[PDB]
Structures are given as C-alpha cells and as structure tokens.
Amino acid sequence: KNRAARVRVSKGDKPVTYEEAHAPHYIAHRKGWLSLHTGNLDGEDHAAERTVEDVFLRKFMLGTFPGCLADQLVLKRRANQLEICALVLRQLPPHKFYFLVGYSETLLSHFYKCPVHLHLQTVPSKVVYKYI
C-alpha cells in the first residue's frame, strides 16, 4: 500500500484541496508541476541549486506568512527572475499583507542575489475539491 504524498479516506467529512486529492501517479496527467525551471531538461546545468532554493522558499513563505497560506506555493523561474505565486487566505488586515510583500521581495532578492517578484492571490476560504 503506497503511502506516498496521499490523503486517506476519512469518515467522508474531510475537506481536500485539488492538489492534495490527486495522488503521485497523477502528475503530468491531471495535476501539474508546482515549480518550473530549466534545470531538468536534457542538456542543462545546476538543477540542484534551483531545488535547494525552491525548498527554502517553501519553508520561508510558510514561516513569514503564518496561518494565512492556502495551497502549496507556485514557483516560476524566468530569465533569472523568480515569480512566486501564492494562494493566500484572507486573515490579515491588508497593511500587514503589503508590509510582508515588501519585506519578502527585498529580503529574498538580496539573499539569492536575483530580482524577485511576488504575487498574492487572496481567497475567502480554502478551495474544496472533494468531500465536505
């Protein structure tokens, strides 16, 4: 029985995000990729760096934006700039949201020594794909 990245069947009441409801064998069939970069294509270099980098930005966004994160965080790399999209729940009063926008962009840009672009799409409640 494969336990990989899966969400078990409950008494049937458990709310589930579209992503967490689609099991590993489904990648590239229904589900998409959470990140995008050149590094894994045939002739390409430095895949590892974009992986460490990605991981750290998962943890970073989960920690800078407490309790307000909706679904897993969507990274794109385009021509040396990062485009970080987030689905974010509405909890915070908007001031704090922009505080953290500036905070994040600046901090990251100076950490990875490349320009970062941030996008928050705000959602009233976690989207429910199944059950509920």
């Binding site: 970069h37 894994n40 294509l41 045939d42 002739g43 390409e44 790399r77 385009r78 021509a79 485009e83």
Partner: protein
C-alpha cells in the same frame, strides 16, 4: 526610442538555428505559433521542425528500508522545436531574437546557433607569405 547608424558593414547570417527544449508539448506549440507570427511580420522567412523526443528514465527503491523487489521509476521528457531562419542581417537577428528570448516561458530553454558569413581573412586573400 533611439536609433543610431554607424558606418560599419553589419554582419550577415546565412542560417539562424534556434532550438527550444521543453517539458510540455503545449507550451512549445504555442511558442512556435508566437515565433512564426513574429517572424511573418518582420519578413524573416522561417521554417520549423520537430526533432525526436528524449525520454530519460531512472530507478529508485520503493521503501525506506528493505524491499528490493520493489522499485519506483521516474521520467523526464524533453521535447524539441527548432526554428530555422534564413538570410538574416545582424540587427534583424538581434531584434528578433531579443523579442523571442524576452518572452521565453519559464519551463523552457533555448539553444541558438548562428552561422555567420565572412568572405576571407586579410592575410590569406591573394598574398602568399
């Protein structure tokens, strides 16, 4: 916008070969469409083709500890489109390619080969030593 003209005899390109690597075939289709539509407007006279797909597979163990009867296998597919342009000027290439590259999607890579036209070097023309 500022244009300048310098007297020097700008570079000719016989063939400009532009390869795009990618994961999703869709993205490379729409990008082909975009490149051909950019080129048609700039009078660039281009062709396109699809080189054979590469699929690299490899194998990991399915458990943390020990069942070596049991594995998982993973893939990466690399899909190709190549835009082959003929009879380009220096500046023409610089602009067209600038427009291409600027709009390059995040999932794809691009490999450019120019074949440049030069008549003959100076010490070889018709001196002999």
């Amino acid at each position: 916008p500022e244009i300048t003209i310098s007297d020097e005899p700008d570079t000719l390109y016989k063939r400009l070969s532009v390869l795009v690597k990618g994961h999703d075939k869709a993205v490379l289709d729409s990008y082909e469409y975009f490149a051909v539509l950019a080129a048609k407007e700039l009078g660039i006279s281009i062709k396109v083709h699809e080189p054979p797909r590469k699929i690299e597979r490899f194998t990991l163990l399915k458990s943390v500890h020990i069942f070596k009867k049991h594995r998982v296998q993973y893939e990466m597919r690399t899909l190709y489109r190549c835009l082959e342009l003929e009879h380009l000027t220096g500046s023409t290439a610089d602009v067209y390619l600038e427009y291409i590259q600027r709009n390059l999607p995040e999932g794809v890579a691009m490999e450019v080969t120019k074949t440049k036209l030069e008549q003959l070097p100076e010490h070889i023309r018709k001196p002999i030593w």
